[PDB]
């Protein structure tokens, strides 16, 4: 199965506005193989990654992840995003971290313009435990049992500057895929769309 | 301790005139603070010495124009004339080419090592000036962001003590 697991696929697509404010939190990512928020309308069908489709068959997994971020700017937009990772559980409240107090944790910087349209990024495996459960079957929230090794946040590192005559805001896709993955304990779980 | 930290940021506008100081910053006094986990190391130590390394970043849209100047001056500018700041270690932010600079200084100071609870005077003042004013088109964003980074090097410590509390 390494094949499906090793190939980046779409995950979530967020807008980024010129009106955005410095130090704001644009979007928050629970970090699992199991997250896809994207969806389509007609025909009626719902996005699911490659990866998300495999691990949703398994009870457990561990390994690196690869977030490849791809931005579609002009040449003439300019700005910097930021990636700040925050280990923990999935339910820890990160909403109260400033821009500063985020950067303390491991982070990466990125520039919008360039001949470089993609940032490979690799979250090293950080856990108390050798694995993570797939919780979503078991409904209510049981203490200590965790899926996402932590949230990932995208701040707005600078405002978004641009001449007057071009599009005012830049979308960015979020790819997803893994490497050195290992999993076991099969099962059948239809994973319904994580929304928000 | 060796890692980077976001420190201070300010936006840069047109209305700033020549040598209107956009940024008067202090390296040390800002690091020591509640907001970081590097705070931990110092707050339990009386004496520390170290080297500094700085990053500075902006993102002028190439239709904008202007330039900025980053000088690392120990003590203060005092009455040292503006003109000569390039004497100090420095780089030149230029809308045209470089969007980034990196400055590295080792330790310079008049005593053995810095002391946090009772700093004599700030070691490294970080000054930034308007080197060539920002002139803009029409409809272009008339502002642009500016950010700063830092990290210690060869950080050494001495003198554990609770008295910080």
């Amino acid at each position, epitope marked *: 199965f390494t094949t499906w697991t090793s190939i980046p696929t779409l995950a979530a697509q967020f807008p980024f506005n010129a*009106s955005d404010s*410095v130090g704001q939190q644009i979007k928050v990512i629970p970090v699992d193989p199991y997250f896809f928020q994207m969806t389509n309308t007609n025909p009626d069908q719902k996005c699911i990654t490659a990866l998300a489709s495999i691990c949703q068959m398994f009870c457990f997994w561990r390994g690196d992840l690869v977030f490849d971020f791809q931005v579609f700017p002009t040449k003439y937009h300019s700005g910097r995003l930021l990636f700040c990772f925050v280990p923990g559980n999935e339910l820890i409240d990160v*909403t109260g971290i400033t821009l500063k107090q985020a950067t303390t944790a491991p982070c990466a910087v990125m520039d919008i313009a360039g001949v470089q349209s993609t940032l490979r990024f690799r979250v090293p495996w950080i856990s108390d435990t050798p694995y993570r459960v797939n919780r979503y079957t078991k409904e209510a929230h049981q203490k200590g049992e965790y899926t996402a090794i932590g949230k990932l946040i995208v701040y707005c590192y600078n405002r978004l500057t641009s001449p007057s005559n071009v599009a005012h805001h830049v979308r960015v896709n979020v790819y997803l895929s893994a490497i050195n993955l290992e999993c076991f304990a099969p099962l059948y779980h239809a994973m319904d769309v994580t929304t928000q | 301790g060796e890692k980077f930290f976001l420190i201070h940021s300010a936006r840069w506008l047109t209305t700033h005139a020549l040598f209107h100081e956009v940024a008067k910053l202090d390296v040390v006094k800002l690091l020591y603070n509640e907001q970081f986990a590097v705070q931990g190391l110092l707050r339990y130590h009386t004496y520390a010495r170290f080297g500094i390394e700085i990053q500075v970043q902006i993102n002028p849209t190439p239709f904008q124009q202007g330039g900025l100047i980053c000088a690392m001056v120990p003590g203060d500018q005092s009455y040292g004339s503006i003109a000569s700041l390039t004497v100090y270690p420095h780089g030149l932010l230029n809308c045209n080419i470089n969007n980034v600079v990196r400055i590295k200084v080792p330790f310079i100071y008049t005593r053995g090592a810095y002391h946090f609870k009772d700093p004599q005077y700030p070691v490294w003042e970080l000054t930034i000036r308007v080197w060539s004013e920002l002139n803009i088109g029409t409809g272009t964003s008339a*502002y642009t962001s500016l950010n700063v980074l830092a990290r210690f090097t060869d950080l050494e410590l001495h003198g554990l003590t609770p008295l910080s509390t």
Partner: antibody, heavy 121, light 106 residues
Framework: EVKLVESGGGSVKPGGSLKLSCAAS????????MSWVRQTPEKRLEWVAT????????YYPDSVKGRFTISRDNARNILYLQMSSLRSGDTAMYYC??????????????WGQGTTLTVSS | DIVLTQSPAIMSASPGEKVTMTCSAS?????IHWYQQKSGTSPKRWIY???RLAFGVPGRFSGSGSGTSYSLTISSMEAEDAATYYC????????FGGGTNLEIKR
């Protein structure tokens, strides 16, 4: 476009209770802490509450401390401000405001129209 | 129990002149945010952090000050600015300024 809609409220006699609701739209709600802020008729303002991203933590100023309740269901992107044992000094305009983040501090962005609580009998 | 003051309560200014208003503190405060309220309208994003700007604002506004002292400054008065301007601190116990009425002169 951000849309904040305050609901409920009116004249209430001292000792009565009330709960208010802010409707949110146009942004992922769970990702932003929320808050209520009071406006006295004097065009003076005061900060009555905040709740964090999830259920998380809740913050109160001293004056109303223990007398008020704040709560969230992100499923509907709607708030609840639960008050009880109100007295006359509470009459004011109340707003809901999404709390966001800057470099070192917290800052309010969008404010709804707000409803009017009147404590008197 | 940490409070702000705004020196002018009410100030009138004509179009084409410089304007100054000052929020002062009962202690030292790192940053101060400003809000703007127009009649029958909820106050809005105005000037956050210290001298940084909101998006929608025109670029003729400025601010400065440090420690206990901070000041909001308007380069050249224009008619569309009439409002009340509130200040704020996030230091400890969240607190607002008493407001400063800006008024057109004629």
């Amino acid at each position: 476009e951000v849309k904040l809609v305050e609901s409920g409220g009116g004249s209430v006699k001292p000792g009565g209770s009330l709960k208010l609701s802010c409707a949110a739209s146009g942004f992922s709600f769970s990702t932003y802490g929320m808050s209520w802020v009071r406006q006295t008729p004097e065009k003076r303002l005061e900060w009555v509450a905040t709740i964090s991203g999830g259920g998380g933590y809740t913050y109160y100023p001293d004056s109303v401390k223990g007398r008020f309740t704040i709560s969230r269901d992100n499923a509907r992107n709607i708030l609840y401000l639960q008050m009880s044992s109100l007295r006359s000094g509470d009459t004011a305009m109340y707003y809901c405001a999404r709390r966001v983040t800057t470099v070192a501090e917290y800052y309010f962005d969008y404010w709804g129209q707000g409803t009017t609580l009147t404590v008197s009998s | 129990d940490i409070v702000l003051t705004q020196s002018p309560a009410i100030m009138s200014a004509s179009p084409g002149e410089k304007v100054t208003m000052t929020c002062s503190a009962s202690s030292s405060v790192s940053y101060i945010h400003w809000y703007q309220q127009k009649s029958g309208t909820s106050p809005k994003r105005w000037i956050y952090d210290t001298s940084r700007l909101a998006f929608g604002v025109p670029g003729r506004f400025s601010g400065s000050g440090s420690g206990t002292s901070y000041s909001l400054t308007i380069s050249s008065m224009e008619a569309e600015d009439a409002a009340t301007y509130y200040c704020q601190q996030w230091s400890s116990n969240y607190t607002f300024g008493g407001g400063t009425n800006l008024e057109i002169k004629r």
